[PDB]
Amino acid sequence: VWLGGLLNPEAYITATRQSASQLNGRLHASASFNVKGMALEGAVWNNDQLTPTDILSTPISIATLTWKDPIFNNSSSKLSVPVYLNETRSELLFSIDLPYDQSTSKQNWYQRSVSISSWKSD
Amino acid sequence: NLPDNLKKLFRSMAMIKPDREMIAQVMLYSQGFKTAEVLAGKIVPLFKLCQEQLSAQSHYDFGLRALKSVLVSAGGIKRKCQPPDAESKTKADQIYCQYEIGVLLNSINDTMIPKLVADDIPLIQSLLLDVFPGSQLQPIQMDQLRKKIQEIAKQRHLVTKQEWVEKILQLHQILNINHGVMMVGP
Amino acid sequence: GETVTFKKPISIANGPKIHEWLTMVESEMKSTLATLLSESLQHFNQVDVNDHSKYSEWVDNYPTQLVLLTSQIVWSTQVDQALGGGTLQQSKIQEQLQSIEQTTQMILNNLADSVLQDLSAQKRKKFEHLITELVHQRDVVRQLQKCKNLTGNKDFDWLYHMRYYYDATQENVLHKLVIHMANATFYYGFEYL
Amino acid sequence: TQMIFQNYLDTLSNEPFDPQEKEQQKRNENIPAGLKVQKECAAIISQYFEPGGLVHKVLED
Amino acid sequence: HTFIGIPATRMDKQPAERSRIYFLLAWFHAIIQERLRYIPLGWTKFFEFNDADLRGALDSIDYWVDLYSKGRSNIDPDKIPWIAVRTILGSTIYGGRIDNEFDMRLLYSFLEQLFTPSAFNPDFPLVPSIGLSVPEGTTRAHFMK
């Protein structure tokens, strides 16, 4: 799927919730849907964890988003990343937890302002 | 937005999105609902959906005012609906937990479905189960009126159709809740 | 539709001018509420909490406006003696608090069932209001029981909220009640609501 | 639509066209020539009103 | 600029650790404000971080920092109600006009990074990459240099 490309991401995602509830029943990152075409701004994907980078935003081949309940414990150490609807950052779609490169202090990641964009011009 | 001559005399406070969950939880407590807490976590979700998963009509509203309005009715409805070791509680306890869910639905069905349209009446049904599994909407126990309504109907040479009589009742109920009711229709 | 007989009648017969007796009701309005608030504190402070038999009587004795303040003023002081002043093992304060979190919690249920019974609207809103209030108290108190290391009756995790403190030892009758929240302090206008 | 058709028909052999016959029949019941006519007419056409009848086929088209 | 408003006849007053905290506010206030020209990276939107806010904070700092050290020519860092000062400068002055939760998250990081007991450590780090640490001083003129 191409979330950001749709005409109403807010709707699609809020729908994949109950469809996932009709089955094995909060969102999680990686029974679940798959989104492709996103863009991580501020960091980069490496060893399955948010890592620093000199380049602005990088693409995201794809990723899975499950609606579990559990794995939500070591978040106090992990980083929180917002999933807006585009660079504008004027519309948040959903928050998401992702592990980061614990090399750089957590406070640095905060002031690092890391977010994910769905739609990206070119 | 404050005039360019007041953004330094005042102190701005952001109040974007409120706290429905809380508002609802306590809202029910004042009515007598012992489940409230648990309940609220479902009544709110239903609303958030009905606004983006039910044919977007012009007479459709699921704002905060709506959520409060309905919860308030559930109180009077419950005030008139007599409730029903180890594995003794778990089973007996659940039963009560349901009684409250029913009273809640009876309110939704009282001042939430009359607003619904054609293509939306079926969708709301599905949505209600995903939220309130242990129950489903009930009929209109108002024999008192239904009796006098069926009399006037035949008197005015009116076809006492089923679906028809239903609406006349839809008013009696919604009126004793929202002193300001408006009947939209072609 | 609520009524609250004054503590000092204002005979307009004597001959008070238009604003003459008017300025009086305002003075008495605040006077009445001023005294009533104190008497309510005295009454409640002399009644059982578990015994909801008398509690249900205490509420129907004072105006909803005051009925709530008392519960607020009572809630305030209790949370302090439960926090001490930087001295009181984690268990000490946590134990002192656990009680208040439960005591008020028990009351909520007593009223939760009393509201589900027969009673007028005017008399109902009072209970519906109290409910809402006690819910705030227990909830706030719980937030405290989540702080492993607390200081005392001055910790910000407590000063953040709006506490109410009374002082019958005060010369004035109005200024007896002093509202606090963060570092700000105001005075209850005693404006009949 | 079928409901409305009956309202018209019923009101025909019930409510008198002439206002006099309505007042004279209202004080007498607690069949002037007029009201009697209406009935005979309502019957002749009745058949055309029922589901699928003329009226429907014509009203729809 | 932030200092043209902060007079020495108010920054050098006891305790001696007050001079520090002021400077800290100027730095924190200089950062959050400077980032507005880097939206949406610096901030989600453009919050009105006017000087009036700064002035208010100074008053608050002069409250807590002067309430737990009234008279003493000094005061211990860990004895300052930062959880109080940071909250006041957070959700009731600077962050008060913040709508995006993630914006406050950023904002507060700056607060909990400057307004804390560890922010007194000699040569406290400001901009390491270049080699910028808090100036060891206790008076207006001291910090100005």
Domain harbouring C134, CATH code? 1.20.58.1120
CATH code, domain carrying A36: 3.10.490.20
Chains that touch C (3 or more CB pairs under 8 A): B, E
Task: From chain D, pick out residues whose CB is under 8 angstroms from the CB of B164.
Answer: 3
Q: Rounded distance, CA A121 to CA A68, Å?
A: 32
> A2 lies in a domain?
no
User: What residue of B is the nearest CA neighbor of E50?
Assistant: B8
State the nearest Cα–Cα gap between C99 and chain E, in angstroms: 27
Residue numbers of the domain that contains C110: 45-193
* Nearest alpha carbon to residue B25 among C105, C67, C131, A21: C131
Q: Rounded distance, CA C5 to CA C64, Å?
A: 14
User: What residue of A is the nearest CA neighbor of B51?
Assistant: A11
What type of residue is E86?
A: R
* Nearest alpha carbon to residue D21 among D6, D45, D9, D37: D37
Picking from E42, E45, E102, the nearest residue to A82 by CB comes out as E102
CA D2 vs CA A65, B143, D15, E119: distances in Å: 54, 27, 20, 84
DSSP output for E57-118: HHHHHHHHHHHSSSS-S---GGGS-HHHHHHHTIIIIIGGG---HHHHHHHHHHHHHHSSGG
Structure tokens at A37: 């075409």
B and D touching (3 or more beta-carbon pairs closer than 8 Å): yes
Torsion sign over Cα C92, C95, C98, C100: negative
Q: Rounded distance, CA B48 to CA B60, Å?
A: 13
Q: Rounded distance, CA B150 to CA B165, Å?
A: 8
Residue pair E87/E100 in contact by the 8 Å Cβ criterion: no
Structure tokens at B149: 């309504």
Q: Per the structure, how many domains does chain A have?
A: 1
Tell whether A99 lies on the interface with E, counting CB pairs under 8 A: no
CB atoms inside a 10 Å sphere around CB A60:
17
Q: Which residues contact E100 (CB under 8 A, 6 or more apart)?
A: A92, E44, E45
> A103 lies in a domain?
yes
A51 forms beta bridges with: A44
Residue numbers of the domain that contains A118: 9-122
Residue pair B74/B39 in contact by the 8 Å Cβ criterion: no
Tell whether A90 lies on the interface with E, counting CB pairs under 8 A: yes
Task: From chain E, pick out residues whose CB is under 8 angstroms from the CB of C147.
Answer: none
HSE-CB of C154 using CA atoms within 13 angstroms: 9
Q: How many helices (H) and strands (E) does chain A have?
A: 2, 9
User: What residue of C is the nearest CA neighbor of E60?
Assistant: C183
> A3 lies in a domain?
no
Q: Per the structure, how many domains does chain E have?
A: 1
Instruction: List residues in chain D that are followed by a break over 2.5 Å (C to N).
Output: 30
A97 forms beta bridges with: A80
State the nearest Cα–Cα gap between C175 and chain B, in angstroms: 28
Q: Which residues contact A73 (CB under 8 A, 6 or more apart)?
A: none
Look at E113 and A88 and tell me if their CB atoms are within 8 Å: no
State yes or no: B185 annotated in a binding site: yes
Give the total residue count for chain C.
Answer: 193
Look at B158 and D7 and tell me if their CB atoms are within 8 Å: yes
Q: What is the resolution of this structure in A?
A: 3.8
> A4 lies in a domain?
no
Tell whether B94 lies on the interface with C, counting CB pairs under 8 A: no
Tell whether A10 lies on the interface with B, counting CB pairs under 8 A: yes
What type of residue is B172?
A: H
* Nearest alpha carbon to residue E34 among E45, E17, E49, E13: E49
Backbone angles phi, psi at A60, to 5 degrees: -135, 100
Backbone angles phi, psi at B121, to 5 degrees: -60, -30
Structure tokens at B67: 């959520």
CATH code, domain carrying E134: 1.10.8.720
Distance, CA of E52 to chain centre: 14
Look at D7 and B161 and tell me if their CB atoms are within 8 Å: no
Residue pair B130/A18 in contact by the 8 Å Cβ criterion: yes
Q: Angle CA(C191)–CA(C61)–CA(C80) in degrees, nearest 5?
A: 70
State the nearest Cα–Cα gap between C26 and chain B, in angstroms: 31
Tell whether C155 lies on the interface with B, counting CB pairs under 8 A: no
Elucidation technique: X-ray
Q: Rounded distance, CA C173 to CA C32, Å?
A: 10
State yes or no: B83 annotated in a binding site: no
Q: Rounded distance, CA B18 to CA B13, Å?
A: 13
> A41 lies in a domain?
yes
Q: Rounded distance, CA E99 to CA C175, Å?
A: 38
Beta strands A79-84; A92-98: pairing state: antiparallel
State the nearest Cα–Cα gap between C158 and chain B, in angstroms: 20
> A29 lies in a domain?
yes
* Nearest alpha carbon to residue E54 among E13, E1, E15: E1
CB atoms inside a 10 Å sphere around CB A113:
22
Q: Angle CA(D10)–CA(D13)–CA(D16) in degrees, nearest 5?
A: 115
Instruction: List residues in chain B that are followed by a break over 2.5 Å (C to N).
Output: 84
Look at E88 and C159 and tell me if their CB atoms are within 8 Å: no
Structure tokens at C146: 């989540």
State the nearest Cα–Cα gap between A23 and chain B, in angstroms: 12
CB atoms inside a 10 Å sphere around CB B51:
14
User: What residue of B is the nearest CA neighbor of C126?
Assistant: B30
Residue numbers of the domain that contains E90: 1-145
| Residue B178, Cβ density class (10 Å: 0-12 exposed, 13-18 middle, ≥19 buried) | middle
My answer on whether omega of the bond before E40 falls inside 30° of 0, hence cis, is yes
